[PDB]
Amino acid sequence: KKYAKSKYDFVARNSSELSVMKDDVLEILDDRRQWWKVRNASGDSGFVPNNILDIMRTP
Amino acid sequence: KKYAKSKYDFVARNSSELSVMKDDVLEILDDRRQWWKVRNASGDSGFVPNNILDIMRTP
Fold first, then answer.
1. Residues 1-59 of B with CB under 8 A from A
2. Rg (Cα) of chain B, in Å, rounded?
3. CA dihedral over B49, B50, B51, B57, signed as positive or negative
4. Do A18 and B33 touch (CB under 8 A)?
5. Which fold has domain B1-59?
6. Are B4 and A38 in contact (CB under 8 A)?
7. Cβ A28–B44 below 8 Å, yes or no?
């Protein structure tokens, strides 16, 4: 059972994000695995775990 | 534009998560800011940026 407290307010820019108020206590899920917000080829947007993604860059 | 390629498949379990297939090319949003999956006092699940949170621990 991992917990954290929000130091600042956070307003979700859309329904896929979660709004929180300063001092709110939250339970951290998935064992702190980190996520990135991404958009696919068809314009769909959402969160994906970043440990299975590889950044693409010029050689 | 910043892009990443998925190395494995990922099946969304929530409407805020985006299902992806191996080899899919995704556009990374929010300048790669890192997010955590959390659950609030109300029991709702969601994503919040991890840099506004202070970890909490009991001695």
1. 2-8, 10, 12, 15-18, 20, 24-30, 32-41, 44-50, 52-56
2. 15
3. positive
4. no
5. SH3 type barrels. (2.30.30)
6. yes
7. no
